[PDB]
Amino acid sequence: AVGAAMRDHILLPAQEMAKLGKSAQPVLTHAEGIYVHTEDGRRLIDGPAGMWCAQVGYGRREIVDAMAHQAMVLPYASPWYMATSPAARLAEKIATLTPGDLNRIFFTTGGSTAVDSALRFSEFYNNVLGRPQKKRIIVRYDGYHGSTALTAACTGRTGNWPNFDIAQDRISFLSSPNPRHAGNRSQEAFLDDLVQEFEDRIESLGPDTIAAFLAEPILASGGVIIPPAGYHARFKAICEKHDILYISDEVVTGFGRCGEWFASEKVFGVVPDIITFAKGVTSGYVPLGGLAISEAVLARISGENAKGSWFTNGYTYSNQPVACAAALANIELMEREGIVDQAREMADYFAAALASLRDLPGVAETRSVGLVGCVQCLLDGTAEDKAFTLKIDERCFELGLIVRPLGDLCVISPPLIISRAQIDEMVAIMRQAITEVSAAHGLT
Amino acid sequence: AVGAAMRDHILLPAQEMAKLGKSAQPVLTHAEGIYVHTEDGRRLIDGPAGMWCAQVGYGRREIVDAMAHQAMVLPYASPWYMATSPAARLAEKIATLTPGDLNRIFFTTGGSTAVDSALRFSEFYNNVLGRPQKKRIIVRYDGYHGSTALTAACTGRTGNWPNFDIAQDRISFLSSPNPRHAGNRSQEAFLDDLVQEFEDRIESLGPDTIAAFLAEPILASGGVIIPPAGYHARFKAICEKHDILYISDEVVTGFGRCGEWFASEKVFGVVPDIITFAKGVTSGYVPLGGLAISEAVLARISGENAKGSWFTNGYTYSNQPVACAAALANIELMEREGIVDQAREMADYFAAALASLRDLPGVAETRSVGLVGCVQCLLGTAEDKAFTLKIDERCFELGLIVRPLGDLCVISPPLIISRAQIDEMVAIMRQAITEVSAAHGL
Ligand SMILES: Cc1ncc(COP(=O)(O)O)c(C=O)c1O
Ligand SMILES: Cc1ncc(COP(=O)(O)O)c(C=O)c1O
């Protein structure tokens, strides 16, 4: 009956239009800890933490109570005219966690709107500065920045492109900083070529035309792609030379995922100009997004430098008290129980548990940073491998584990509170699923 | 200290950059019924119902208990892979309330992303049909459709435009359908000119280049601008002639605001191809938006006609169980207490109460539809814009929030507002207009 309602009345994200009104999705009913349950009652490990969001897991009354209390007391105030305590205190809190002087926050309802607003900010910025040509955005193939028209245009995941008008002169794609595209080169020489590609792009487009460089610290939806060490710092140095805003998209990496509140500086060696965030900010309990903007950047277009300008960008649910109260409870809980510390302390055990799968003939590679990980499966990335990995994903589900299928990769990013025992349980399910499917494909 | 934290750590929507770090907003602390209260302890009527969203007003535990329950049980499920009861039941519920066959729903987190997705669909739709040139969007001056880069560019409120790269070749602006722009013409003849301008625009651009016509039924943020009667049906007929998708933006008008679940057909006489909604679907308790798409539209690009296409648009919080449970509880509460019927029955009284202000020398005009209305104040000019801001400020001091909008004071109260509370609201307005007028010498 729930399935019949989904089928007849919902348009799904990434819906195969040939199977519109015939599609089946598993029905989830309830959840606790790292676990979710089907309408059959069967318990499964939420390997992706929903969608890299459920940092503290499911069933935390602390977030729910703070949500409910604020919803009753004062659920809405217009952010154009009226201030609230939740928004004020949340912005104050996040300002203590960000690198450098990124101490002023603009709030949105999710990651796309935050990145959209970061990009609209880069426009505004250069317009106020009297640089109307300085508008272009530099991104990478395999990157993901959202699903608004502009943010999808900034998205390097080309599987999302068909039947959308993605290409435009404002946006230029650099190569994916994938270590396994290094070929006959060392990782250090591959990084040399990556960096040179960027400065060549700057030269051919003209620095005076480029507003922003937009980059996830690791390319999560691309398949947990970790740039060769030093990438972020080398690119930042180049941005600063040409006065190009570095927007680090920490929608996935932020709020504990890479063992830190923000991965940009502490893990990846970059102090960005802007950080975007979502997901983990509320542990996926309610929609919130936003962007932290550098004080020195804002000073150049405000005060005596304002030129009578007004930042006429904003959403109805920007600074919404309910979502901000929930996030505040989330962060306070994560602080209280050292959950960010927990993720940092579990990272090596996580990496090593995944690495024990490299034993298998079906496994090409495993990688990870913090508690985001990846198992690459090849028949030995062709079309045969994608279907093979899909069958592994399916077998994992049957044995009690949700993995996220990304082409030839099984992706896991579990709640940050996952134990050593639960990690091994997860891995043992993956091992069984890989072994059995590989046998049906003649791997020996 | 709350105001110190806003000052130093928050960038506001429409922030005056000359006053960044010095802007002070009144702090709201708590709310109940139609009222909200400031930090200083003053009680205020929420005249705009927040931002045309608080349909049932504040403190309804029905919505909050349903939020809390879902948040504990299953707060998140990935919309790409996993289904949920609240999302499914809510989509089913909305489908019973929309005009025509607008029976399939795509959820987003708000109004902008609903409209952004509607427009991305129009693009997807024509690409799947083998019509890659059929992409242009027709909108109107004074219209408002959002704050994403695409939806802002579709926004005809030119006050939002400076220092943003709004202009683009895909989007063309018609004249605002504003009755006070008729001049020497009758309202009917003015309507004839609006319709003719649209037809001429289609011919000038070429019909085969136009994907969508995007329009609020009434132009809310644009200044409670109600098109001459017949506008919507006549534009729709023209849309259908050229296979242009009529996208009716009911982000403000939807869920009771015009005395109806959806204003499009039952008030303004158009069955659209797509309806976008948000705000009042949850009574403002939690972010939710979405769009309702016509079954016939979708059939042309799905099933046998799919051409191996995949609608690869979607947000992480699409179909979010908590927002959908809140919305479902909101709608069910509105059904039980007949709140849509209440708003329909209160509209004439609301209209007449505002019209009692026309008495005043300072008041030029009042207009309304359903439970959205406005009062025009003149001494027009920027002097009148500063005059109206003063009236707004005096209203606040006397216990009423109004939305300032040029020379208009705009109200859109919770739909459960009583005759008594309407009178209270108007008495505050009357006092504030008489006081500011006398101080300006009138
Ligand atoms: C890195 C990154 N940025 C932006 C987004 C878009 O966020 P949302 O889907 O909440 O709009 C995503 C998607 O989760 C993302 O992974
Ligand atoms: C008619 C209309 N459409 C779209 C929007 C944008 O909605 P949101 O601010 O939730 O993104 C607005 C503002 O609420 C609106 O008034």
Provide CATH code, domain A60-337: 3.40.640.10
A413 Cβ contact list (under 8 Å, min separation 6) = A47, A48, A49, A52, A220, A252, A257, A371, A372, A373, A404
Is B112 assigned a ligand-binding role in the annotation?
A: yes
- Identify the DSSP state of B225: B
The amino acid that residue A270 corresponds to is V
Q: How far apart are CA A377 and CA A361, in angstroms?
A: 9
- Shortest distance, CA B358 to any CA of chain A (angstroms): 27
Euclidean distance between CA atoms B26 and A195, whole angstroms: 49
Q: How far A184 CA sits from the closest chain B CA (Å)?
A: 35
Are A76 and B284 in contact (CB < 8 Å)?
A: yes
Q: What's the order of all strands across the beta sheet hosting B35-38? A: B28-32, B35-38, B43-46, B400-401
Q: Which two tokens stand for residue B145?
A: 């459709």
| Distance (Å) from CA A221 to ligand 1 centroid | 9
Measured at the alpha carbon of residue A54, what is the angle toward residues A40 and A57, in degrees to the nearest 5? 70
Fold adopted by B1-59+338-442: Aspartate Aminotransferase, domain 1 (3.90.1150)
Q: What is the Cα–Cα distance from A191 to A196, expressed in whole angstroms?
A: 8
Question: Contact, A405 vs A389, CB < 8 A?
Answer: yes
* Pocket-testing residue among A52, A108, A116, A144, ligand 1, by greatest number of atoms within 8 A of Cβ: A144
8 Å CB contact between A434 and A362: yes
- In angstroms, the CA A293 to CA A280 distance is 19
Ligand 2 center to B268 CA (angstroms): 20
Tokens matching residue B248: 């009716």
Quick one: DSSP state of residue B356? Answer: T
Spell out which residues of chain B touch residue A92, defining contact as CB-CB under 8 Å: 5, 8-9
C-alpha A402, offset from chain centre? 18
Residue (of B77, B316, B276) closest to A112 by Cα position: B316
Beta strands in A147-239 (DSSP E): 171-174, 210-215
E strand map for A50-144: 102-108, 136-140
Cα of B279 from ligand 2 centre, angstroms:
8
Residue contact A71–B64, C-beta within 8 A: yes
CATH of range A1-59+338-444; options 3.40.50.9100, 3.40.50.2000, 1.10.3720.10, 3.90.1150.10: 3.90.1150.10
Yes or no, beta carbons of A2 and B27 under 8 Å apart: no
Cβ atoms A244, A213 nearer than 8 A = yes
Question: Would you say A233 and A270 are in contact if contact means Cβ atoms under 8 Å apart?
Answer: yes
> Which residue's alpha carbon is nearest to atom 4 within ligand 1?
A145
Find residue B376's DSSP bridge partners.
B365, B408
C-alpha triplet A42, A43, A44: angle, nearest 5°: 120
Question: Do residues A225 and A218 lie in contact, with contact meaning Cβ atoms separated by under 8 Å?
Answer: yes
CA–CA distance, B177 with B193 (Å, rounded to integer): 10
Residue of A nearest to B19 (CA): A303
Cβ–ligand 1 distance for A110 under 6 Å, the answer: yes
Please tell me what DSSP assigns to residue B109.
S
Between the two ends of chain A, the Cα-to-Cα distance in Å is 44
DSSP H or E segment with residue A246: strand A245-249
Q: How far is CA A165 from the centre of its chain?
A: 23
Annotated domain spans of chain B: 1-59+338-442, 60-337
Q: Do B105 and A11 touch (CB under 8 A)?
A: yes
Tokens at residue A387, please?
């279907």
> CA–CA separation, A121 vs A311, rounded Å?
8
DSSP annotation of B139: E
Residue with tokens 């203590």: A96
* Strand ranges, E, within B109-194: 136-140, 171-174
* Interface probe, candidates B147, B257, B281, B300, chain A, greatest A C-beta count within 10 A: B147
DSSP character for B18? Answer: G
Tokens 């690198």 label which residue? A99
Which residues are paired to B83 by β-bridges?
Answer: A27
CA atoms in the 13 A half-sphere facing the CB of B25 = 29
Identify the burial level of B398 via C-beta atoms within 10 angstroms of its C-beta, where 0-12 means exposed, 13-18 middle and 19 or more buried.
middle
Closest CA in chain B for residue A5: B88
Q: Is B220 in the pocket of ligand 2 (CB under 6 A)?
A: yes
Measured distance CA(A294)–CA(A297) in Å, rounded: 5
Q: How far apart are CA A389 and CA A379, in angstroms?
A: 10
Q: Where are the alpha helices (DSSP H) in A30-110?
A: 49-52, 61-73, 85-95
List residues bridging with A210 in a β-sheet: A136
Those residues with Cβ within 8 angstroms of residue A355's Cβ, 6 or more apart along the chain or in another chain: A366
3-state SS class at B39: coil
Residues of A in contact with B75 (CB under 8 A): 31, 54, 58, 64, 283-286
Distance in angstroms (rounded) separating the CA atoms of residues A270 and B349: 61
Do A110 and B317 lie within an 8 Å CB cutoff? Answer: yes
Reading the block at residue B144, the tokens are 């408002």
Residue whose C-alpha is closest to residue A16's, from B132, B128, B89: B128
Is A315–B112 a contact, with Cβ atoms under 8 angstroms apart?
A: yes
- Give alpha helix (H) positions in B60-154: 61-73, 85-95, 111-128, 149-153
Give the tokens for residue B421: 């509370």
* Rg, Å, chain A Cα set: 22
Closest ligand 2 atom to Cα of B109: 10
Q: Report the amino acid identity of residue B327.
A: A
Beta-bridged to residue A310, according to DSSP, are: B16
Is B276 annotated as belonging to a binding site? no
- Cα(A112)–Cα(B69) distance, rounded to whole angstroms? 27
HSE-up of residue B354 (Cα within 13 Å, Cβ side) = 26
Q: How far is the CA of B109 from the centre of ligand 1 (A)?
A: 13
Q: Cα–Cα distance between B386 and A342 in angstroms, integer?
A: 56
The count of other CB atoms within 10 Å of the CB of residue A141 is 17
Helix residue ranges per DSSP H, B134-292: 149-153, 187-205, 231-241, 263-266
User: What is the DSSP annotation of B53-81?
Assistant: T-TT-B--HHHHHHHHHHHHH-----TTT
Hey, which residues does B373 pair with through a beta bridge? Answer: B368, B411
Partners of B117 on chain A (C-beta within 8 Å) are 147
Best mutation site among B112, B268, B276, B412 for ligand 2 pocket (most ligand atoms within 8 Å of CB): B112
SS3 A425: helix
Which DSSP helix (H) or strand (E) runs through B333?
helix B321-336
Q: Measure B293 CA to nearest chain A CA, in Å.
A: 9
* Min distance B283 CA to chain A CA atoms (Å): 9
CB-based contact A219:A154 (threshold 8 Å)? no
In this complex, the residue of A85, A319, A402 whose CB is nearest that of residue B2 is: A85
